[PDB]
Amino acid sequence: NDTLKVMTHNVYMLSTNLYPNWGQTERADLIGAADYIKNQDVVILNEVFDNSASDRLLGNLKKEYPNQTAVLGRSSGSEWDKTLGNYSSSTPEDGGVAIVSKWPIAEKIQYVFAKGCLSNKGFVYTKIKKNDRFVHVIGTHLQAESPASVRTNQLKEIQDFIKNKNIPNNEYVLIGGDMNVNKINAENNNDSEYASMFKTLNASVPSYTGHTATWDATTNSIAKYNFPDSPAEYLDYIIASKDHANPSYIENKVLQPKSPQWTVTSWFQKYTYNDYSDHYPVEATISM
Protein backbone atom coordinates (compact mmCIF):
# COMPACT_ATOMS: atom_id res chain seq x y z
CA ASN A 1 0.00 0.00 0.00
CA ASP A 2 0.91 3.69 0.17
CA THR A 3 1.86 3.44 3.84
CA LEU A 4 5.26 2.83 5.41
CA LYS A 5 5.55 1.59 8.98
CA VAL A 6 8.87 2.15 10.73
CA MET A 7 9.56 1.55 14.41
CA THR A 8 12.54 2.47 16.53
CA HIS A 9 13.30 1.05 19.95
CA ASN A 10 16.24 1.51 22.29
CA VAL A 11 16.05 -1.95 23.89
CA TYR A 12 18.59 -1.39 26.66
CA MET A 13 20.66 -4.55 26.15
CA LEU A 14 23.85 -3.66 27.98
CA SER A 15 26.73 -6.12 27.88
CA THR A 16 26.25 -9.02 30.28
CA ASN A 17 29.98 -8.80 31.00
CA LEU A 18 29.31 -5.50 32.77
CA TYR A 19 25.68 -6.08 33.79
CA PRO A 20 25.11 -9.85 34.15
CA ASN A 21 21.66 -9.50 35.68
CA TRP A 22 19.62 -7.11 33.55
CA GLY A 23 17.52 -9.87 31.97
CA GLN A 24 19.05 -9.33 28.54
CA THR A 25 18.56 -12.93 27.39
CA GLU A 26 15.01 -13.18 28.70
CA ARG A 27 14.07 -9.80 27.24
CA ALA A 28 15.48 -10.86 23.87
CA ASP A 29 12.84 -13.60 23.90
CA LEU A 30 10.10 -11.35 25.29
CA ILE A 31 10.71 -8.60 22.73
CA GLY A 32 11.01 -11.15 19.95
CA ALA A 33 7.54 -12.49 20.74
CA ALA A 34 5.99 -9.11 21.63
CA ASP A 35 2.92 -7.86 19.78
CA TYR A 36 4.08 -4.23 19.73
CA ILE A 37 7.04 -4.94 17.44
CA LYS A 38 4.93 -6.82 14.86
CA ASN A 39 3.36 -5.44 11.68
CA GLN A 40 6.14 -3.02 10.77
CA ASP A 41 7.99 -2.62 7.48
CA VAL A 42 11.28 -1.69 9.14
CA VAL A 43 12.53 -1.75 12.73
CA ILE A 44 15.49 0.25 14.04
CA LEU A 45 17.08 -1.11 17.21
CA ASN A 46 19.32 0.81 19.62
CA GLU A 47 21.51 -0.48 22.46
CA VAL A 48 21.77 -4.06 21.25
CA PHE A 49 25.23 -4.13 22.84
CA ASP A 50 25.35 -7.60 24.40
CA ASN A 51 26.60 -9.90 21.68
CA SER A 52 24.71 -13.04 22.73
CA ALA A 53 21.42 -11.36 23.61
CA SER A 54 21.46 -9.16 20.52
CA ASP A 55 22.01 -12.13 18.22
CA ARG A 56 19.26 -13.98 20.09
CA LEU A 57 16.89 -11.04 19.59
CA LEU A 58 17.75 -10.74 15.91
CA GLY A 59 17.18 -14.47 15.53
CA ASN A 60 13.79 -14.17 17.21
CA LEU A 61 12.85 -11.36 14.82
CA LYS A 62 14.02 -13.32 11.75
CA LYS A 63 10.64 -14.94 11.09
CA GLU A 64 8.84 -11.66 10.49
CA TYR A 65 11.89 -9.53 9.63
CA PRO A 66 14.33 -11.83 7.77
CA ASN A 67 16.28 -9.00 6.12
CA GLN A 68 18.76 -7.77 8.71
CA THR A 69 21.91 -5.70 9.03
CA ALA A 70 24.85 -6.60 11.24
CA VAL A 71 25.25 -4.58 14.44
CA LEU A 72 26.96 -1.23 13.92
CA GLY A 73 30.64 -1.30 14.88
CA ARG A 74 30.94 -5.00 15.69
CA SER A 75 32.78 -5.95 12.48
CA SER A 76 33.85 -4.42 9.17
CA GLY A 77 33.71 -7.20 6.59
CA SER A 78 31.60 -7.80 3.50
CA GLU A 79 28.48 -7.85 5.68
CA TRP A 80 28.59 -4.09 5.11
CA ASP A 81 28.76 -2.59 1.63
CA LYS A 82 30.90 0.17 3.11
CA THR A 83 32.33 0.93 6.53
CA LEU A 84 32.63 4.68 6.92
CA GLY A 85 33.89 6.98 9.61
CA ASN A 86 36.09 6.48 12.65
CA TYR A 87 35.62 2.72 12.89
CA SER A 88 38.01 1.01 15.33
CA SER A 89 38.38 -2.75 15.78
CA SER A 90 39.93 -2.14 19.21
CA THR A 91 36.92 -0.58 20.95
CA PRO A 92 35.56 -2.40 24.02
CA GLU A 93 31.99 -2.20 22.69
CA ASP A 94 30.07 -1.83 19.42
CA GLY A 95 27.60 0.87 18.36
CA GLY A 96 24.53 -1.13 19.32
CA VAL A 97 22.46 -0.18 16.26
CA ALA A 98 20.85 -2.60 13.82
CA ILE A 99 18.03 -2.49 11.30
CA VAL A 100 15.70 -5.32 10.32
CA SER A 101 12.97 -5.39 7.68
CA LYS A 102 10.40 -7.61 6.01
CA TRP A 103 11.57 -6.17 2.69
CA PRO A 104 14.74 -6.76 0.66
CA ILE A 105 17.64 -4.53 1.73
CA ALA A 106 19.51 -3.29 -1.35
CA GLU A 107 22.30 -1.47 0.48
CA LYS A 108 23.80 -1.64 3.98
CA ILE A 109 26.33 0.94 5.16
CA GLN A 110 27.72 1.65 8.62
CA TYR A 111 29.20 4.96 9.73
CA VAL A 112 31.09 5.62 12.95
CA PHE A 113 30.93 9.17 14.35
CA ALA A 114 34.18 11.12 14.51
CA LYS A 115 33.49 12.72 17.88
CA GLY A 116 32.05 11.86 21.28
CA CYS A 117 32.37 12.76 24.96
CA LEU A 118 35.09 3.36 23.02
CA SER A 119 31.91 2.08 21.38
CA ASN A 120 31.89 2.82 17.63
CA LYS A 121 28.71 4.88 18.02
CA GLY A 122 27.28 6.11 14.73
CA PHE A 123 24.57 5.16 12.28
CA VAL A 124 23.39 2.44 9.93
CA TYR A 125 22.11 3.29 6.45
CA THR A 126 19.78 0.99 4.53
CA LYS A 127 18.18 1.24 1.11
CA ILE A 128 15.05 -0.89 1.23
CA LYS A 129 12.78 -2.04 -1.59
CA LYS A 130 9.18 -1.77 -0.42
CA ASN A 131 6.73 -2.80 -3.14
CA ASP A 132 8.75 -1.64 -6.18
CA ARG A 133 9.73 1.54 -4.30
CA PHE A 134 13.13 2.29 -2.73
CA VAL A 135 12.96 3.88 0.72
CA HIS A 136 16.00 4.91 2.75
CA VAL A 137 16.25 4.39 6.48
CA ILE A 138 19.06 5.61 8.69
CA GLY A 139 19.10 4.31 12.25
CA THR A 140 21.24 5.99 14.90
CA HIS A 141 21.88 6.57 18.61
CA LEU A 142 23.48 9.89 19.53
CA GLN A 143 25.76 11.06 22.34
CA ALA A 144 24.05 10.82 25.73
CA GLU A 145 23.97 13.58 28.34
CA SER A 146 29.13 20.05 25.54
CA PRO A 147 27.08 16.91 24.75
CA ALA A 148 24.79 19.10 22.63
CA SER A 149 27.80 20.27 20.64
CA VAL A 150 28.78 16.64 20.07
CA ARG A 151 25.28 15.63 19.02
CA THR A 152 25.11 18.51 16.56
CA ASN A 153 28.40 17.35 15.07
CA GLN A 154 27.04 13.81 14.80
CA LEU A 155 23.81 15.06 13.22
CA LYS A 156 25.92 17.05 10.75
CA GLU A 157 27.77 13.88 9.73
CA ILE A 158 24.42 12.21 9.03
CA GLN A 159 23.18 15.10 6.89
CA ASP A 160 26.50 15.28 5.05
CA PHE A 161 26.31 11.54 4.29
CA ILE A 162 22.75 11.81 2.98
CA LYS A 163 23.68 14.73 0.71
CA ASN A 164 26.78 12.97 -0.58
CA LYS A 165 24.78 9.81 -1.39
CA ASN A 166 22.84 11.55 -4.19
CA ILE A 167 19.56 9.85 -3.26
CA PRO A 168 16.67 10.70 -5.63
CA ASN A 169 14.62 13.67 -4.44
CA ASN A 170 11.43 11.67 -5.02
CA GLU A 171 12.29 8.87 -2.60
CA TYR A 172 11.68 8.91 1.15
CA VAL A 173 14.68 9.32 3.45
CA LEU A 174 14.05 8.66 7.13
CA ILE A 175 16.35 9.23 10.09
CA GLY A 176 15.40 7.47 13.30
CA GLY A 177 16.58 6.40 16.71
CA ASP A 178 17.44 7.67 20.18
CA MET A 179 18.67 11.20 19.45
CA ASN A 180 19.10 12.10 23.12
CA VAL A 181 17.60 15.45 22.18
CA ASN A 182 14.75 16.30 24.57
CA LYS A 183 11.55 17.74 23.10
CA ILE A 184 9.88 18.46 26.44
CA ASN A 185 9.67 22.20 27.15
CA ALA A 186 11.67 23.00 24.01
CA GLU A 187 9.01 23.19 21.29
CA ASN A 188 8.58 26.96 21.56
CA ASN A 189 12.26 27.80 21.93
CA ASN A 190 13.60 28.27 18.40
CA ASP A 191 17.12 28.24 19.83
CA SER A 192 16.62 24.91 21.60
CA GLU A 193 18.61 21.80 20.72
CA TYR A 194 15.30 20.22 19.71
CA ALA A 195 14.66 22.94 17.14
CA SER A 196 18.27 22.75 15.94
CA MET A 197 17.95 19.01 15.25
CA PHE A 198 15.50 19.53 12.40
CA LYS A 199 17.59 22.33 10.90
CA THR A 200 20.85 20.39 11.09
CA LEU A 201 19.22 17.35 9.47
CA ASN A 202 17.06 19.49 7.19
CA ALA A 203 14.16 17.31 8.33
CA SER A 204 10.49 18.02 8.96
CA VAL A 205 8.54 17.82 12.22
CA PRO A 206 6.21 14.79 12.47
CA SER A 207 2.73 14.65 13.99
CA TYR A 208 3.01 13.47 17.59
CA THR A 209 0.64 10.95 19.15
CA GLY A 210 0.63 8.47 22.02
CA HIS A 211 2.51 8.84 25.31
CA THR A 212 4.22 12.14 26.15
CA ALA A 213 7.68 10.70 26.87
CA THR A 214 9.97 7.97 25.51
CA TRP A 215 12.10 7.68 28.66
CA ASP A 216 9.74 7.89 31.63
CA ALA A 217 10.76 6.96 35.17
CA THR A 218 7.21 7.78 36.29
CA THR A 219 5.66 4.88 34.35
CA ASN A 220 8.55 2.64 33.27
CA SER A 221 9.81 0.06 35.80
CA ILE A 222 13.38 -0.02 34.51
CA ALA A 223 13.81 3.76 34.25
CA LYS A 224 12.27 4.01 37.72
CA TYR A 225 14.97 1.75 39.15
CA ASN A 226 17.85 3.70 37.57
CA PHE A 227 16.60 7.29 37.98
CA PRO A 228 13.34 7.32 40.01
CA ASP A 229 13.35 11.11 40.44
CA SER A 230 14.40 12.13 36.93
CA PRO A 231 11.73 14.03 34.95
CA ALA A 232 10.32 12.16 31.95
CA GLU A 233 12.08 12.89 28.66
CA TYR A 234 11.22 12.68 24.95
CA LEU A 235 14.32 11.46 23.10
CA ASP A 236 13.32 9.02 20.34
CA TYR A 237 12.29 10.09 16.81
CA ILE A 238 11.73 8.99 13.21
CA ILE A 239 11.76 11.95 10.85
CA ALA A 240 11.93 12.62 7.10
CA SER A 241 14.49 14.59 5.11
CA LYS A 242 13.03 17.66 3.42
CA ASP A 243 15.62 17.39 0.65
CA HIS A 244 13.81 14.32 -0.61
CA ALA A 245 10.24 12.99 -0.75
CA ASN A 246 8.18 15.04 1.71
CA PRO A 247 5.49 12.85 3.34
CA SER A 248 1.97 14.26 3.10
CA TYR A 249 1.63 12.75 6.56
CA ILE A 250 4.16 11.40 9.04
CA GLU A 251 3.26 10.40 12.57
CA ASN A 252 5.44 9.43 15.53
CA LYS A 253 3.43 7.48 18.10
CA VAL A 254 4.96 6.62 21.47
CA LEU A 255 3.70 3.25 22.70
CA GLN A 256 3.72 2.03 26.30
CA PRO A 257 3.74 -1.76 25.85
CA LYS A 258 4.21 -3.76 29.03
CA SER A 259 6.07 -7.06 28.99
CA PRO A 260 5.17 -10.26 30.82
CA GLN A 261 6.72 -10.14 34.29
CA TRP A 262 10.37 -11.20 34.37
CA THR A 263 12.68 -11.52 37.35
CA VAL A 264 16.40 -11.21 37.94
CA THR A 265 18.56 -11.71 41.01
CA SER A 266 21.32 -9.40 42.20
CA TRP A 267 23.08 -9.27 45.55
CA PHE A 268 20.86 -11.99 47.02
CA GLN A 269 17.89 -9.77 46.14
CA LYS A 270 15.17 -10.56 43.61
CA TYR A 271 13.85 -7.84 41.30
CA THR A 272 10.80 -8.04 39.05
CA TYR A 273 10.01 -5.84 36.04
CA ASN A 274 7.30 -5.59 33.41
CA ASP A 275 9.03 -3.46 30.78
CA TYR A 276 10.96 -4.50 27.67
CA SER A 277 13.40 -1.62 28.06
CA ASP A 278 13.84 1.66 29.95
CA HIS A 279 12.81 3.41 26.72
CA TYR A 280 9.41 3.16 25.06
CA PRO A 281 9.22 2.36 21.32
CA VAL A 282 8.16 4.88 18.69
CA GLU A 283 5.93 3.73 15.86
CA ALA A 284 6.02 5.92 12.77
CA THR A 285 3.37 5.89 10.06
CA ILE A 286 4.35 7.55 6.80
CA SER A 287 1.88 8.18 4.00
CA MET A 288 3.55 7.72 0.62
CB of 51 to Ca ion, least distance (A): 5
Output 12 or 65, the one with its CB closest to Ca ion: 12
Output 133 or 224, the one with its CB closest to Ca ion: 224
Residue nearest to Ca ion (CB): 94
CB of 15 to Ca ion, least distance (A): 6
Contact between 144 and 155 (Cβ < 8 Å): no
Output 91 or 202, the one with its CB closest to Ca ion: 91
CB of 33 to Ca ion, least distance (A): 23
CB of 162 to Ca ion, least distance (A): 25
Q: Please give the Cα distance from 215 to 280 (Å, whole number).
A: 6
Output 49 or 234, the one with its CB closest to Ca ion: 49
Residues of the shown chain interacting with Ca ion in the complex, contacts defined by CB under 5 A: 49, 51, 94
Contact between 68 and 33 (Cβ < 8 Å): no
